[PDB]
Design a protein around this motif. Structure first.
Motif, PDB file in Angstrom:
ATOM      1  N   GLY A   1     -58.109  13.153 -60.559  1.00 24.01           N
ATOM      2  CA  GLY A   1     -57.438  13.743 -61.521  1.00 24.01           C
ATOM      3  C   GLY A   1     -57.991  14.726 -62.651  1.00 24.01           C
ATOM      4  O   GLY A   1     -59.118  15.194 -62.437  1.00 24.01           O
ATOM      5  N   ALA A   2     -57.357  15.161 -63.617  1.00 26.37           N
ATOM      6  CA  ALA A   2     -58.228  15.722 -64.605  1.00 26.37           C
ATOM      7  C   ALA A   2     -59.401  15.191 -65.204  1.00 26.37           C
ATOM      8  O   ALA A   2     -60.383  15.787 -65.738  1.00 26.37           O
ATOM      9  N   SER A   3     -59.534  13.824 -64.817  1.00 25.88           N
ATOM     10  CA  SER A   3     -60.944  13.175 -64.814  1.00 25.88           C
ATOM     11  C   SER A   3     -62.136  14.098 -64.475  1.00 25.88           C
ATOM     12  O   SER A   3     -63.109  14.427 -64.705  1.00 25.88           O
ATOM     13  N   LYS A   4     -61.709  14.352 -63.101  1.00 28.13           N
ATOM     14  CA  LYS A   4     -62.500  15.592 -62.097  1.00 28.13           C
ATOM     15  C   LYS A   4     -62.915  16.724 -63.091  1.00 28.13           C
ATOM     16  O   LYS A   4     -64.168  17.267 -63.021  1.00 28.13           O
ATOM     17  N   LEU A   5     -61.993  17.237 -63.913  1.00 26.65           N
ATOM     18  CA  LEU A   5     -62.256  18.603 -64.471  1.00 26.65           C
ATOM     19  C   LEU A   5     -62.692  18.252 -65.800  1.00 26.65           C
ATOM     20  O   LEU A   5     -63.970  19.036 -66.139  1.00 26.65           O
ATOM     21  N   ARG A   6     -62.842  17.135 -66.495  1.00 21.73           N
ATOM     22  CA  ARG A   6     -63.436  16.756 -67.582  1.00 21.73           C
ATOM     23  C   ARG A   6     -64.860  16.357 -67.147  1.00 21.73           C
ATOM     24  O   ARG A   6     -65.985  16.985 -68.357  1.00 21.73           O
ATOM     25  N   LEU A 295     -55.065  18.956 -69.758  1.00 20.60           N
ATOM     26  CA  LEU A 295     -55.919  19.866 -69.224  1.00 20.60           C
ATOM     27  C   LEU A 295     -55.681  19.968 -67.522  1.00 20.60           C
ATOM     28  O   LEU A 295     -55.830  21.268 -67.137  1.00 20.60           O
ATOM     29  N   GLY A 296     -55.288  19.027 -66.829  1.00 21.11           N
ATOM     30  CA  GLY A 296     -55.057  19.264 -65.598  1.00 21.11           C
ATOM     31  C   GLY A 296     -53.942  20.290 -65.160  1.00 21.11           C
ATOM     32  O   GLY A 296     -53.831  21.185 -64.592  1.00 21.11           O
ATOM     33  N   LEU A 297     -52.648  20.021 -65.997  1.00 20.67           N
ATOM     34  CA  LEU A 297     -51.561  20.958 -66.044  1.00 20.67           C
ATOM     35  C   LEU A 297     -51.851  22.228 -66.221  1.00 20.67           C
ATOM     36  O   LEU A 297     -51.400  23.476 -65.557  1.00 20.67           O
ATOM     37  N   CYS A 298     -52.474  22.651 -67.529  1.00 17.39           N
ATOM     38  CA  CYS A 298     -52.903  23.700 -67.926  1.00 17.39           C
ATOM     39  C   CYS A 298     -53.755  24.593 -66.986  1.00 17.39           C
ATOM     40  O   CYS A 298     -53.496  25.753 -66.674  1.00 17.39           O
ATOM     41  N   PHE A 299     -54.797  23.873 -66.556  1.00 16.96           N
ATOM     42  CA  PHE A 299     -55.563  24.655 -65.340  1.00 16.96           C
ATOM     43  C   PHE A 299     -55.087  24.933 -64.209  1.00 16.96           C
ATOM     44  O   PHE A 299     -55.126  26.132 -63.729  1.00 16.96           O
ATOM     45  N   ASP A 300     -53.914  24.019 -63.892  1.00 17.20           N
ATOM     46  CA  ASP A 300     -53.183  24.413 -62.543  1.00 17.20           C
ATOM     47  C   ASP A 300     -52.023  25.634 -63.110  1.00 17.20           C
ATOM     48  O   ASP A 300     -51.940  26.628 -62.237  1.00 17.20           O
ATOM     49  N   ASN A 301     -51.504  25.779 -64.076  1.00 16.32           N
ATOM     50  CA  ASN A 301     -51.028  27.092 -64.579  1.00 16.32           C
ATOM     51  C   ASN A 301     -51.705  28.214 -64.494  1.00 16.32           C
ATOM     52  O   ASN A 301     -51.411  29.181 -64.045  1.00 16.32           O
ATOM     53  N   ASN A 349     -55.589  20.723 -52.713  1.00 19.89           N
ATOM     54  CA  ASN A 349     -56.241  19.502 -52.153  1.00 19.89           C
ATOM     55  C   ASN A 349     -56.944  18.915 -53.715  1.00 19.89           C
ATOM     56  O   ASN A 349     -57.995  18.292 -53.376  1.00 19.89           O
ATOM     57  N   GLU A 350     -56.511  19.277 -54.875  1.00 19.30           N
ATOM     58  CA  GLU A 350     -57.141  18.525 -56.007  1.00 19.30           C
ATOM     59  C   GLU A 350     -58.261  19.241 -56.318  1.00 19.30           C
ATOM     60  O   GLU A 350     -59.346  18.498 -56.841  1.00 19.30           O
ATOM     61  N   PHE A 351     -58.916  20.416 -55.743  1.00 22.43           N
ATOM     62  CA  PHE A 351     -59.992  21.208 -56.075  1.00 22.43           C
ATOM     63  C   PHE A 351     -61.533  20.532 -55.437  1.00 22.43           C
ATOM     64  O   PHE A 351     -62.158  20.071 -56.354  1.00 22.43           O
ATOM     65  N   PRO A 352     -61.432  20.223 -54.226  1.00 23.06           N
ATOM     66  CA  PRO A 352     -62.614  19.506 -53.914  1.00 23.06           C
ATOM     67  C   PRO A 352     -63.972  20.138 -54.240  1.00 23.06           C
ATOM     68  O   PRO A 352     -65.018  19.590 -53.939  1.00 23.06           O
ATOM     69  N   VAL A 353     -63.951  21.399 -54.388  1.00 29.21           N
ATOM     70  CA  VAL A 353     -65.136  22.369 -54.742  1.00 29.21           C
ATOM     71  C   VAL A 353     -65.561  21.696 -56.004  1.00 29.21           C
ATOM     72  O   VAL A 353     -66.911  21.614 -56.386  1.00 29.21           O
ATOM     73  N   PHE A 354     -65.028  20.921 -56.862  1.00 31.32           N
ATOM     74  CA  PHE A 354     -65.535  20.130 -57.816  1.00 31.32           C
ATOM     75  C   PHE A 354     -66.054  18.737 -57.826  1.00 31.32           C
ATOM     76  O   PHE A 354     -66.296  17.997 -58.899  1.00 31.32           O
ATOM     77  N   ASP A 355     -65.932  18.210 -56.308  1.00 31.97           N
ATOM     78  CA  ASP A 355     -66.022  16.966 -56.190  1.00 31.97           C
ATOM     79  C   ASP A 355     -67.779  16.677 -56.232  1.00 31.97           C
ATOM     80  O   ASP A 355     -68.437  17.610 -56.230  1.00 31.97           O
TER      81      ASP A 355
HETATM   82  O1  YO6 Z   1     -54.377  13.798 -62.753  1.00 29.16           O
HETATM   83  C1  YO6 Z   1     -54.346  13.972 -64.272  1.00 29.16           C
HETATM   84  O2  YO6 Z   1     -55.225  13.870 -64.789  1.00 29.16           O
HETATM   85  C2  YO6 Z   1     -53.197  15.040 -64.647  1.00 29.16           C
HETATM   86  C3  YO6 Z   1     -52.834  16.113 -63.734  1.00 29.16           C
HETATM   87  C4  YO6 Z   1     -51.834  16.836 -63.854  1.00 29.16           C
HETATM   88  S1  YO6 Z   1     -51.898  18.208 -62.808  1.00 29.16           S
HETATM   89  C5  YO6 Z   1     -53.698  17.941 -62.780  1.00 29.16           C
HETATM   90  N1  YO6 Z   1     -54.323  18.892 -62.096  1.00 29.16           N
HETATM   91  C6  YO6 Z   1     -55.973  18.880 -61.490  1.00 29.16           C
HETATM   92  C7  YO6 Z   1     -56.312  20.178 -61.479  1.00 29.16           C
HETATM   93  C8  YO6 Z   1     -57.663  20.276 -60.770  1.00 29.16           C
HETATM   94  C9  YO6 Z   1     -58.346  18.919 -60.881  1.00 29.16           C
HETATM   95  F1  YO6 Z   1     -59.453  18.979 -60.271  1.00 29.16           F
HETATM   96  C10 YO6 Z   1     -57.607  17.608 -61.037  1.00 29.16           C
HETATM   97  C11 YO6 Z   1     -56.550  17.690 -61.395  1.00 29.16           C
HETATM   98  N2  YO6 Z   1     -54.000  16.683 -63.380  1.00 29.16           N
END
Ligand code: YO6
Ligand code: YO6
Ligand code: ZN
Length: 356
Positions: A1-6, A295-301, A349-355
């Motif tokens: 999830g967004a934990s991957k982005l953080r 953060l996750g929703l906004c990055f998806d936008n 696929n939830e951005f596996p490039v960031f795995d």
């Molecule tokens: O799962 C969450 O924490 C909320 C959420 C809603 S949409 C979204 N996108 C998302 C995009 C890239 C990524 F690497 C991980 C997540 N994250």
């Protein structure tokens, strides 16, 4: 999830002290060049343009590459658009009230970019070989901008761009651009368009054309980016706008790295992602649409809009709406289709490039 982005953002911070040290090397050489340039007739009004978001005059473009812009006040500007391109122009001077410092660079009535560029290079190369006791080497790339690429002890590359400054009203092609009224306000748009605009030497084929540049306005809207004037100045108003742009740039860097075996992505740049990001700020003007927690929703936008630009082959310059960065003249259809497929897979696929 967004934990991957953080987690990605946390990892990027680990490089923070390295690129702050390298930029300290850049700031020292650039300052050294500015003092030499000011001693020259045409360049006495040369200065450092404010384009960086972390170091005032040193922009970070990618890991260990820096951009710097040298601005030169040039009064009495007169612009003639080059063949309906909207962004490229010949530079003439308002009819002679005595002669200008740049008289040496004319061709008939037109200010020669190649003439002006050649003297810019020479003065700088003098300060590369006059002080050959420093580890700097100079490459010359194709286009007139960047004009000079210095290599500092290797691994540290810095692009130096010359930019004419005009304090005149912005050209007609920008009249419908900078659509920030619903986000940053009409008052702000009015104030921004009272600032100067810039022209960099660039050809469209080749002519003596100059291209508009708004790097200073871009820096200002990224740093002062909220509908609220106190966005990101207190704990109650933390948005994720800057982090979303960071992640979009990193996404593109990582894909280009992975597709290095064939280099089908070499025409895409961080400028494309930044332009798309500014459009998404216009689309989502409220700070509540950029809540830190989202953060996750906004990055998806951001990714979804970038994908739309690729699929429709249209990414308008944020200041010059009829200038399409994704026109087939600039990026061929096959490259845009290729990047579309990769980003679409990553988003699905939830951005596996960031795995990890
Ligand atoms: O799962 C969450 O924490 C909320 C959420 C809603 S949409 C979204 N996108 C998302 C995009 C890239 C990524 F690497 C991980 C997540 N994250
Ligand atoms: O803007 C930059 O400095 C770097 C960059 C990368 S691609 C690109 N195109 C572009 C085209 C017209 C224009 F008016 C402004 C920009 N510019
Ligand atoms: Zn903010």
């Amino acid at each position: 999830g967004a934990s991957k982005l953080r987690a990605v953002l946390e990892k990027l911070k680990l490089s923070r002290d390295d690129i702050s040290t390298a930029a300290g090397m850049v700031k020292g050489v650039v300052d050294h060049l500015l003092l030499r340039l000011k001693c020259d007739s045409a360049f006495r009004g040369v200065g450092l343009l404010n384009t960086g978001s972390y170091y005032e005059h040193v922009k970070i473009s990618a890991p260990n590459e820096f951009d710097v812009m040298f601005k030169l006040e040039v009064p009495r500007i007169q612009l003639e658009e080059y063949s309906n391109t909207r962004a490229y122009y010949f530079v003439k001077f308002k009819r002679n009230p005595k002669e200008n410092p740049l008289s040496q660079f004319l061709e008939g009535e037109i200010l020669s970019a190649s003439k002006m560029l050649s003297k810019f290079r020479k003065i700088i190369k003098e300060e590369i070989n006059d002080i050959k006791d420093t580890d700097v080497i100079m490459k010359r790339k194709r286009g007139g901008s960047p004009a000079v690429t210095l290599l500092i002890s290797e691994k540290i590359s810095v692009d130096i761009t010359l930019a004419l400054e005009s304090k005149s009203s912005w050209p007609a092609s920008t009249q419908e651009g900078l659509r920030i009224q619903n986000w940053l306000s009409a008052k702000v748009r009015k104030q921004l368009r009272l600032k100067p605009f810039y022209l960099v030497p660039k050809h469209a084929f080749q002519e003596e054309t100059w291209r508009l540049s708004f790097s200073h306005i871009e820096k200002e809207i990224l740093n002062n980016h909220g509908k609220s004037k106190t966005c990101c100045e207190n704990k109650e108003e933390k948005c994720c706008r800057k982090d979303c742009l960071k992640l979009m740039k990193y996404l593109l860097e990582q894909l280009k790295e992975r597709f290095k075996d064939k280099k089908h992505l070499d025409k895409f740049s961080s400028y494309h992602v930044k332009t798309a990001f500014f459009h998404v700020c216009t689309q989502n003007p409220q700070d509540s649409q950029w809540d830190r927690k989202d953060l996750g929703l906004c990055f998806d936008n951001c990714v979804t809009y970038f994908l739309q630009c690729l699929r429709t082959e249209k990414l308008e310059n944020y200041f010059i709406p009829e200038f399409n960065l994704f026109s087939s003249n600039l990026i061929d259809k096959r490259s845009k289709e290729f990047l579309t497929k990769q980003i679409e897979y990553e988003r699905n696929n939830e951005f596996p490039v960031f795995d990890e």
